[PDB]
UniProtKB/Swiss-Prot annotation, chains B, C:
It comes from Nostoc sp. (strain PCC 7120 / SAG 25.82 / UTEX 2576). Its EC number is 4.1.1.39. This is Ribulose bisphosphate carboxylase large chain. Pfam families: RuBisCO_large, RuBisCO_large_N. Induction: Part of the rbcL-rbcS operon, transcribed in light and constitutively during growth on fructose. Keywords: Bacterial microcompartment, Calvin cycle, Carbon dioxide fixation, Carboxysome, Disulfide bond, Lyase, Magnesium, Metal-binding, Monooxygenase, Oxidoreductase, Photorespiration, Photosynthesis. RuBisCO folding and assembly commences when the nascent large subunit folds with the help of chaperonin GroEL-GroES. Both RbcX and Raf1 help folded RbcL release from the chaperonin and dimerize; dimeric Raf1 binds to RbcL(2) leading to an RbcL8-Raf1(8) complex. RbcS displaces Raf1, resulting in holoenzyme formation. The basic functional RuBisCO is composed of a large chain homodimer in a 'head-to-tail' conformation. In form I RuBisCO this homodimer is arranged in a barrel-like tetramer with the small subunits forming a tetrameric 'cap' on each end of the 'barrel'. GO terms for cellular component: carboxysome. Mg(2+) binds at residues 174, 176-177.
Swiss-Prot record, chains D, E:
It is found in: Carboxysome. Induction: Part of the rbcL-rbcS operon, transcribed in light and constitutively during growth on fructose. It comes from Nostoc sp. (strain PCC 7120 / SAG 25.82 / UTEX 2576). InterPro entries: RuBisCO_ssu, RuBisCO_ssu_dom, RuBisCO_ssu_sf. RuBisCO folding and assembly commences when the nascent large subunit folds with the help of chaperonin GroEL-GroES. Both RbcX and Raf1 help folded RbcL release from the chaperonin and dimerize; dimeric Raf1 binds to RbcL(2) leading to an RbcL8-Raf1(8) complex. RbcS displaces Raf1, resulting in holoenzyme formation. Its main location: other. This is Ribulose bisphosphate carboxylase small subunit. One of its GO terms (molecular function) is ribulose-bisphosphate carboxylase activity. Keywords: Bacterial microcompartment, Calvin cycle, Carbon dioxide fixation, Carboxysome, Photorespiration, Photosynthesis. Belongs to the RuBisCO small chain family.
Amino acid sequence: RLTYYTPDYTPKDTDILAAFRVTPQPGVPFEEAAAAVAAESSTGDLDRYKGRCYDIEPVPGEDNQFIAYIAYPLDLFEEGSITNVLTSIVGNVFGFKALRALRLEDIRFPVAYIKTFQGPPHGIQVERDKLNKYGRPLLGCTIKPKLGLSAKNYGRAVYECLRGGLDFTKDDENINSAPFQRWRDRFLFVADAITKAQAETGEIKGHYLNVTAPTCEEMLKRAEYAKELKQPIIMHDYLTAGFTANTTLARWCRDNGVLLHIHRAMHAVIDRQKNHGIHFRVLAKALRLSGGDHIHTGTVVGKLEGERGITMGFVDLLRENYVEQDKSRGIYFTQDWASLPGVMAVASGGIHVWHMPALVEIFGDDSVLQFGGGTLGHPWGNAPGATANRVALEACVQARNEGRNLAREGNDVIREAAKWSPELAVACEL
Amino acid sequence: RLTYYTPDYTPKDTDILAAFRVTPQPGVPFEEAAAAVAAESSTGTLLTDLDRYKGRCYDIEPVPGEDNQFIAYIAYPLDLFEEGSITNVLTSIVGNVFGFKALRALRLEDIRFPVAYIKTFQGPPHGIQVERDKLNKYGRPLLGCTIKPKLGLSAKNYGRAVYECLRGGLDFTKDDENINSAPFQRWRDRFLFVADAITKAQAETGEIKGHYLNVTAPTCEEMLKRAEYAKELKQPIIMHDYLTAGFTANTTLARWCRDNGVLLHIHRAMHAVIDRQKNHGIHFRVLAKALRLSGGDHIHTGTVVGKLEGERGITMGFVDLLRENYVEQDKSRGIYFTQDWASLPGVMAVASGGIHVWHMPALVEIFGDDSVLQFGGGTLGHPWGNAPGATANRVALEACVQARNEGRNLAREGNDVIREAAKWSPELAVACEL
Amino acid sequence: RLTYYTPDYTPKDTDILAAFRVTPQPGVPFEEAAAAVAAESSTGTLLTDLDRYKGRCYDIEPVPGEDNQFIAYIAYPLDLFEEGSITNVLTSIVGNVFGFKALRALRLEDIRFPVAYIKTFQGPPHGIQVERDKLNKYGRPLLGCTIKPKLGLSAKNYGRAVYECLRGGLDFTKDDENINSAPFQRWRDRFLFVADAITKAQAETGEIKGHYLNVTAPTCEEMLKRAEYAKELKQPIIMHDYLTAGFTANTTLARWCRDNGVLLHIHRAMHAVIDRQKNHGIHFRVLAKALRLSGGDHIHTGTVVGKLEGERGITMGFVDLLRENYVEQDKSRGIYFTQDWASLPGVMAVASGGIHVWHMPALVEIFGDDSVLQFGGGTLGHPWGNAPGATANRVALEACVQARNEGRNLAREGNDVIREAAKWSPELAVACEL
Amino acid sequence: QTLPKERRYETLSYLPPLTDVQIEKQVQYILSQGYIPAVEFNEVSEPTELYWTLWKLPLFGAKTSREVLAEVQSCRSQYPGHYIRVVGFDNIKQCQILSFIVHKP
Amino acid sequence: QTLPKERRYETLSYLPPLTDVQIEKQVQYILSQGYIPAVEFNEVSEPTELYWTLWKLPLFGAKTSREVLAEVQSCRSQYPGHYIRVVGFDNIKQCQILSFIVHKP
């Protein structure tokens, strides 16, 4: 072999670059495995259609590991298919035997190949225009408990969260339909809890109705029903259901005006390990090229400077048009998204009232903030627990719209909003 | 917590068991992490009944020979999950629980879909039996080339390499991973110039030859218009990369192929992201059981010849899970739960390593009759082309099928029947050296 | 009450008569129970006109030889019931009236659909005549195996037992009651490997062979996609278990088979719940008239050979009701109302007892030309297989067809023509002893 | 012992080859029921091919006499290479009462 | 050197023409696994034509004995112009365990 490691190949602006993180077996030299991670992701002509490696760049601070930049040509891949990028690139390359652990860190879809895709149905700008929610990061409950709640008692907990100024309310991962709660009746009693919570407080309330289904016929008849309840948004667990079902539902949600909340269910099978898998900034690029107006980007509050540099790394990749190659922040390739619409970055960890000054500064306006993730609820319920998370939101947006430095004057603006809010002042401590 | 760790809980015959391989962060005890992997895959941390829908860890069983690792057997109830949705098994079980931060690595080893929950699925479109009845190919492991080169070939030159392999005794011929459609080779033309090359090689030699036409596509509409075209070319078989395209698109095509009589070759592309590390991910015997419940008449189970005794007992573990009706709990052979498939149809186990002529004693002995043997993946073809290259891969089959059916122990008398079949075949004798 | 017992009421030629067999509780007089079975099947116990929509008992006629039992002839008007709905005859007539508590047993013996109400129905898709014109099989009762064993056979082994029976002169071949689809044998594959076995046996021996493909299904969508597939295999005939699947699914498939040229074999599964007791239920001559009005070109009328004179006059009563245009009121032969069918097409009467070779004199004499003779139900096959077993069942047919067409009284000269046909047929001579 | 692959034809094919006395005794069932019998000839006996060509008429001269029987032998001398039938006809029920081959090529 | 255009037939066709000792030793795999061997004959070996006609019965020797090729030699003398098979049968798995041609025309 060793015709797949071409280190003088300055890669074309139409190639589809991929930056693996190879950890080769002991005794395997770095030129030979980098020509091998470019080997079995192609051609297992050759000058026109081979994935070729063009740089090594060993990982600083660690031996026996490097970052093999592979340069796949454009015309190898299907126009508009992200299930052909992952079939071609990460199909038969992670199981190659001369590699102890292979991790796809980043990938560069060019301007030439982003234009074949749809992008999100609605961006940041188009989504906020449809919702008429401007200049603040949006909100969310997650209805706890997950299981057990019948379709109306689930809807009553949706009505109770959405009364308290909460923008959206998430349906769970494992709630698709189940003998205690069918989707036809979950969707009915939720859309009857939104038209009451939108009539009570005039804001456009929504619920991420889970349309993840066994088949693509049962997914679109689960989304064509959320269309005919006049629902603003649906959601879709996008890695258990795959990139053929998202791109089916992306093309639907753009062509039916429904927003799409992509949930990163089963994401951590394939990126939790720091040496093997597919890092989420590939999977965040992969669903910006399939659809999604939202994506969970986890949380920032329980992470160090490097682990939230990486977390803010792919948050810029799924939300900003042009992102410069900044390897310390995790982004390995300068990604030009070619005016593709953005995706929201949904913060959903164990965040609570006091993380509002950070998460309005870290995550900007273009964000959604979920709640109930790890925290022990609110002692007064849901409608006080959502008004706590909405006053503490807009107390931090009020201070941000007055120049107050929310890294230092942030805990002050919660405590001076606990005076003019009683539901906040009881979530002020627990 | 420790309300989700019920160690006395004998699990019911209708629970959906799951055997994780938890590698907890230090200081996290084993019960409290195993209650946690039963926590965030259900009922997360009095509005309902907890004790009816909660996942319960019920046994720990520390892994022998390696501390900080155990096998948390979790017992999810039946009525937590959706009838017929294998993308709701994974959204429930491996959804929110691997990124759990008290755990350094978590590996879903095995999973027991009960008889109550297998019956909501479809199974394969066609089993071992109905696949062999449609193809009229009995008592031998079936065959396949893989068309090299992958990239670059136009659709007719691609179909000439299909027609050349399908003359010389080969049963099937695989379309590649990274070939769905691409500006050199569109699918409408690749499927057309392969149907014109099957019905030439099927009419020439009277066996029902097929080709795994790749219907993996960007959308589920583009997938089914890619499969309904292979239906209208009267093709016997399509294929689908079920882990890139997902389980919603696979179960859509499962239901399609059963309702249209097309065989489905499930290809395990992007499987090694999640089953290759021994500490974290989803072991393939979960993903083997997951597509026996959704569609597929064939699934790549890789190979045996490059692996040890322990690494092929585990590979012959999940070959039995996707091919046999009842499989006993044998953990040395890798299976953690006894699995009644409730007369669900089998899936072929496809052998697709870097394999050649001299492995026909091995892969007819290891993989039985109910198998498919791919070729051309790693080995460098044949000096006389594809049609003598495929007859070398077919005379070596039926020599090893004839030898196995005469008491000849192919483990020991296997290299004799390759050498005594290279005499009566000139196409095999030149393949006998490399 | 006794406003519903009008004993002077000469019923009109457009009423829908019904002859119950009322067994009233003691102390209930005969007129007041017969007015009651005319009550709760209408106009139950003024906002309307009662005298226009009420059911009127008009004659009592006590059953000879058995007290506490009579034959309440009820005269329902025409415009009470739905045009074209035989599931509204039964909802009106036998709907709310058998569970009536002043009655120990109530049996709907016979029913007279008038010429005015027969014309709203479709009849069979194809009659006796149009069924014989589609199959080109004239002047003989047609045939059929029944594929034993029922359960366990895969779809190709099932079609081999079909092809073996359909070689040796057999016309049809029945798919079983308890075979619709099951995890050993799906319908898409059972229909496929039977169409490949009809067109092998039809092309071999130049008669239009058929097979009663079972399109009985869970839903009416799954039934019609099971029949539209037997249309697209160009199958001549399907079948349908019309009392388990009901009269709404039958009349759906009636209208389908007429609009698609498929013959419909109606099977009387679950009939013996309601026609087997002599005191209570719905006599089969109601259910025979009920599917002549909805679909069916064939209906099982059971057998004659195991029954007395009185129990076969009643069986040849409803064979004439479903096969002849006009049938006179003869109560010893079982028919209670004279029934003009208004040129509605006939239904074949299928003989499917425990019958074999030696019953071909009997079932060509009793059941005429316009019949089908099943086999293999109770009798233990044949020692030489199915194709000599079917030629034994076909040479014995055409010996008894030739004998009947030469004046030879098969009642008396019938066992001679079996024995003098076993000489010229070796397949029949070994079937001549058992 | 087995069953041979033998192509068979119509509603009296599973018999010995029908001689002339039998066919005289066969049509004497047809015309005695008031039915009009006929002769139909064809090149091949195909399952697809469902019409056979009528020979001169559905011939009839009296209530019961030799009508068909002489006409078949005239057709055996005319067409010694066609599948000859004898068919009955009913006009009340309006279908054929028999259809059987008297002569094969 | 090339590969000739040679029509091949079934699951043991890519071999030398199977002699009698081999087939006796072949069926001794079939019936020793508790399976049911049989003989199936056909005029042509077509990919469309997917049924072949079962010769007499799905045979069986006592638990293991030679009744199959001994009957094939009676079928080679009965039908010397048909594609003769020897097929196995399983009852548990319910498919054929072999399907191979012993005799060609």
